[PDB]
């Protein structure tokens, strides 16, 4: 239209004001955000002793999903189910027969850290899952070595929150199975073999090779330019 005419702008470097731009890379983040980001950077810039970085090698998404699918079949009795079973016991044990035998043998996953460790070294645990994001890392550093010594399959799965949700809790440091249904024996054996080949059979040479020797983006570019 003749009434409409173009007005190109020449922002440049020494003329009319610049327009609005995204400054996410330059914003002054809250002190806690910067502190946590710098902590994350430090955790990767410093040489981590071998027991550290033994985590961060996590079960692949396919095998982790298969393991979680198998575990979902053995979630522990929830509050509503617990109340239903209590009512059944109070209406059958005293009014019927078979003291405490009215209900069948229960099967559920084991997730208590102290209880899971107590199950190991006995030993009855068949499969163990260890969270890789436990803030007090010392709580789980010995679990891989303990499982290796006891010959119990173990996997370092990603996310304690996922384990907790799998067991009706906010978070769970570990999860394990002690007794499983016969129908799932083949699946349990396959998962155990895969987890062993991924972690147990590999955590004898991986005990060496200190990790954490990763430089930053700017440092990486500078060293690459210097080498070139």
């Amino acid at each position: 239209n003749p009434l409409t005419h173009s007005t190109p702008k020449n922002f440049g470097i020494g003329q009319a004001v610049q327009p609005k731009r995204n400054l996410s890379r330059y914003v002054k983040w809250p002190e806690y955000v910067r502190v946590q980001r710098q902590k994350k950077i430090l955790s990767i810039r410093l040489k981590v002793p071998p027991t550290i970085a033994q985590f961060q090698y996590t079960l692949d998404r396919n095998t982790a999903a298969e393991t979680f699918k198998l575990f979902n079949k053995y979630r522990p009795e929830t509050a509503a189910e617990k109340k239903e079973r209590l009512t059944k016991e109070a209406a059958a044990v005293a009014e019927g027969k078979s003291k405490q035998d009215a209900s069948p043998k229960p099967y559920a996953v084991k997730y208590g850290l102290n209880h899971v460790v107590a199950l190991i070294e006995n030993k009855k645990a068949k499969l163990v899952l260890i969270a890789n994001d436990v803030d007090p890392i010392e709580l789980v550093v010995f679990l891989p070595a303990l499982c290796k010594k006891m010959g119990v399959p173990y996997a370092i799965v990603k996310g304690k929150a996922r384990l907790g949700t799998l067991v009706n809790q906010k978070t769970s440091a570990v999860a394990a199975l002690t007794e499983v249904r016969a129908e799932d024996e083949a699946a349990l054996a396959k998962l155990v073999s895969t987890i062993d080949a991924n972690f147990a059979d590999k955590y004898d040479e991986v005990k060496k090779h200190w990790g954490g020797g990763i430089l930053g983006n700017k440092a990486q570019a500078k060293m690459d330019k210097r080498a070139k």
Binding site: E31, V35, Q38, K39, L42, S43, L46, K47, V48, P49, P50, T51, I52, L113, N114, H115, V117, A118, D135, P136, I137, E138, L139, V141, F142, L146
Partner: protein, 67 residues
């Protein structure tokens, strides 16, 4: 359970794992205020042996004092 594993691990302060965790933790705490609350105890075994209980009413605080 994990009682003795952690109890003995905390004693090997000169080990590489502990000498790295201590460095990370001291760096982290130096950025925070001199006196600040801790969401959960960093040494559950020590807190438990010092009468701590994991229930409402128990609070853990982190503080640093100049040497």
């Amino acid at each position: 359970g994990a009682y003795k594993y952690l109890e003995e691990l905390q004693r090997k302060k000169q080990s590489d794992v502990l000498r790295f965790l201590q460095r990370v933790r001291v760096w982290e705490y130096r950025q925070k205020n001199v006196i600040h609350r801790a969401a959960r105890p960093t040494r559950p075994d020590k807190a438990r042996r010092l009468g701590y209980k994991a229930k409402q009413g128990f609070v853990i605080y982190r503080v640093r004092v100049r040497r």
